[PDB]
Symmetry: D2
Subunit: 144 residues, 4 copies
């Protein structure tokens, strides 16, 4: 349900994850620096606090408050309560993060004030909301 890989400080390249989606709950991906600031959360809400199939991007300092949510369209939430295998990729660009899902680009996310790279940790968190089918993590990768 929770796994991380820590990388040698990363200012370019990509982080990827493959997982089987849950019918309920949320899958969260956290990109941290050593300060443990959240440079980016990619928070895919399957069914979460009354929201269905909602993707949320945000950042924040370690003991800190969420910035504004961004909510892109195009994340491959399966219909009808189904589940599937999802591959997600975060490019660490000069500009900001680039998020792709199944090789399709979802959103460009410019780096937030005082939170640019290097990334040093990439974390998967599945949180349940009484799902019939819970998320299964298959892999975590760093792309150089």
């Amino acid at each position: 349900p929770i796994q991380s890989i820590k990388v040698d400080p990363m200012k370019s390249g990509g982080l990827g994850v493959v997982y089987r989606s849950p019918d309920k709950g949320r899958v969260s991906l956290y990109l941290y620096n050593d300060g443990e600031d959240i440079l980016l959360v990619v928070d895919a809400r399957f069914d979460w606090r009354g929201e269905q199939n909602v993707l949320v991007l945000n950042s924040k300092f370690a003991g800190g408050e969420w910035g504004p949510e961004v909510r892109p369209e195009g994340f491959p939430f399966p219909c009808c309560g189904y589940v599937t295998t999802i591959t997600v990729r975060v490019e660490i660009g000069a500009d900001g993060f680039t998020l792709s899902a199944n090789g399709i680009e979802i959103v460009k996310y410019p780096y937030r004030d005082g939170l640019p790279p290097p990334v040093t940790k990439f974390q998967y968190v599945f949180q349940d909301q009484g799902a019939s089918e819970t998320a299964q993590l298959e892999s975590l990768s760093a792309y150089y």
Copy 2:
């Protein structure tokens, strides 16, 4: 919008397709014998004849009539009018075909009476129903 591969008669291995889903229309995959009978259609209805996110599998002889529809759950249609990359595979087993999408097994389908392998041809067909994102075929594969 229509593309096929022709193979030496296959009685095992697999046929795969990758494509970018459409927001409307249907993507059907046809597996034929040398007689041009349809041993199997894998009919992914994204938005077709007032149906939405429906998978239909059936068989019929060349000029004949469709037999009994099977409508399995789990095919990973995207929510919300979104598109994604879908990988589908059909194994040709001893007793039936095994259909999988994104590496997850969808259903097993016993060969219909007098419609057994060998498969000799595997064809992708997308038919529009005024989609704003039309299907894009990426590849067709034969597995030994």
Copy 3:
């Protein structure tokens, strides 16, 4: 040891193979048009009629003689009589083929005059020469 796909007339995309290499003998990939001209042969000689670890490309008319033979470097022939899986890809570009193996571009190859695409058939052929490990075909693909 011989397998082929016939595709619809292809002026675009690519064609792929995946196989487990032989410790001797040759593996040839032929690209035909409808007339059965050889628009390209990618002939990988592991141990063949005097030669070891040599790559040969040519084209010929169905009738006629060969052309000037090109022998690129870079083809991943394994050392020491080992075998491995080889992935090979032939892009059908505007001006010639591009050959790659395991994702590394091996050579570009301008179309011989009188022998441009459409390509209508991609064929794999293994010919033994007393291998302790013969080749095994894993897949053939058309990319659009």
Copy 4:
């Protein structure tokens, strides 16, 4: 040419690497615990001090060295993409390359999982084509 991923300690699953090979030098893959013990190194010697195209496995805190056949060192001057996978099984590591099993390596006393670190290290020895790391993976 040195990279690592540190993972929450793993007693099952797998570690993968993809890189483009060098024509000289060695690329070495290390599996470490918390104390930097070498639970296993997979040392692909393309051209390394007299040895050519040799695979070497071992562990340390040296000890007996295994030398499996079948690792896909390319012939001639050549380089390619290589995909190596190491499974953390119950009996030991299982190592494969380009989808093919190369050998099984029982854990050695004092050196069991969990694995906390997987590290790639290319050391050059005059290569005209240097190694290029492409990705490092953990499988769960």
